[PDB]
Amino acid sequence: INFARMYLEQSDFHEKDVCVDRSSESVTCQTFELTLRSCLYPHIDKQYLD
Amino acid sequence: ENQNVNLTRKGSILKNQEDTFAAELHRLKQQPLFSLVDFEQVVDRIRSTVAEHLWKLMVEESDLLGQLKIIKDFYLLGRGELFQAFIDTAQHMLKT
């Protein structure tokens, strides 16, 4: 295990986003305030109610 | 919208068709020329949907018929015998 960690696990350490771009569905994208109210405010209200 | 502010979460008149009208508007945005005819057609479709849902709300949800019956009985003196007795009682009060 020690040598694995020091050599093989050392060698194999190749252990090397919200796309809020309205451009895709700008016509379908809610208003910034409407988008906020529909994506953030409802979850906050749910947690508040709970 | 103003009624849905006070009314419980009754969905949009267009419900899932709201997005359909959004797609139609996107098509209008995709139209190279503004046509009043196509815009009016889409507007009329939306208007008709809203008007039908509003009629349903008015007749079933808002009981327009009950209110009209009330108006007949009171505003139109539909309870004529009642208002007759009322007049008979109030004649002395209203002469002054």
Swiss-Prot record, chain A:
Reported tissue expression: Widely expressed, with highest levels in heart and skeletal muscle and moderate levels in brain.
UniProt subcellular location: Cytoplasm, Cytoskeleton, Microtubule organizing center, Centrosome
Annotated TM spans: none
The protein's assembly and partners: Component of the gamma-tubulin ring complex (gTuRC) consisting of TUBGCP2, TUBGCP3, TUBGCP4, TUBGCP5 and TUBGCP6 and gamma-tubulin TUBG1 or TUBG2. TUBGCP2, TUBGCP3, TUBGCP4, TUBGCP5 and TUBGCP6 assemble in a 5:5:2:1:1 stoichiometry; each is associated with a gamma-tubulin, thereby arranging 14 gamma-tubulins in a helical manner. Gamma-tubulin at the first position is blocked by TUBGCP3 at the last position, allowing 13 protafilaments to grow into a microtubule.
Function field: Component of the gamma-tubulin ring complex (gTuRC) which mediates microtubule nucleation. The gTuRC regulates the minus-end nucleation of alpha-beta tubulin heterodimers that grow into microtubule protafilaments, a critical step in centrosome duplication and spindle formation.
Family: Belongs to the TUBGCP family.
Descriptive protein name: Gamma-tubulin complex component 5
Species: Homo sapiens
Gene that encodes the chain: TUBGCP5
UniProtKB/Swiss-Prot annotation, chain B:
Family per similarity comment: Belongs to the TUBGCP family.
The protein's assembly and partners: Component of the gamma-tubulin ring complex (gTuRC) consisting of TUBGCP2, TUBGCP3, TUBGCP4, TUBGCP5 and TUBGCP6 and gamma-tubulin TUBG1 or TUBG2. TUBGCP2, TUBGCP3, TUBGCP4, TUBGCP5 and TUBGCP6 assemble in a 5:5:2:1:1 stoichiometry; each is associated with a gamma-tubulin, thereby arranging 14 gamma-tubulins in a helical manner. Gamma-tubulin at the first position is blocked by TUBGCP3 at the last position, allowing 13 protafilaments to grow into a microtubule.
Localization terms from the record: Cytoplasm, Cytoskeleton, Microtubule organizing center, Centrosome
Transmembrane intervals: none
Disease the record associates with this protein: Microcephaly and chorioretinopathy, autosomal recessive, 3: A disorder characterized by congenital microcephaly and chorioretinal dysplasia associated with poor vision and nystagmus. Variable ocular anomalies include microphthalmia, retinal folding, retinal detachment, optic nerve hypoplasia, absence of retinal vessels, round areas of chorioretinal atrophy, and attenuated electroretinogram. Most patients have mild developmental delay and mild learning difficulties.
Provenance organism: Homo sapiens
Protein name: Gamma-tubulin complex component 4
Tissue/organ expression: Ubiquitously expressed.
Function: Component of the gamma-tubulin ring complex (gTuRC) which mediates microtubule nucleation. The gTuRC regulates the minus-end nucleation of alpha-beta tubulin heterodimers that grow into microtubule protafilaments, a critical step in centrosome duplication and spindle formation.
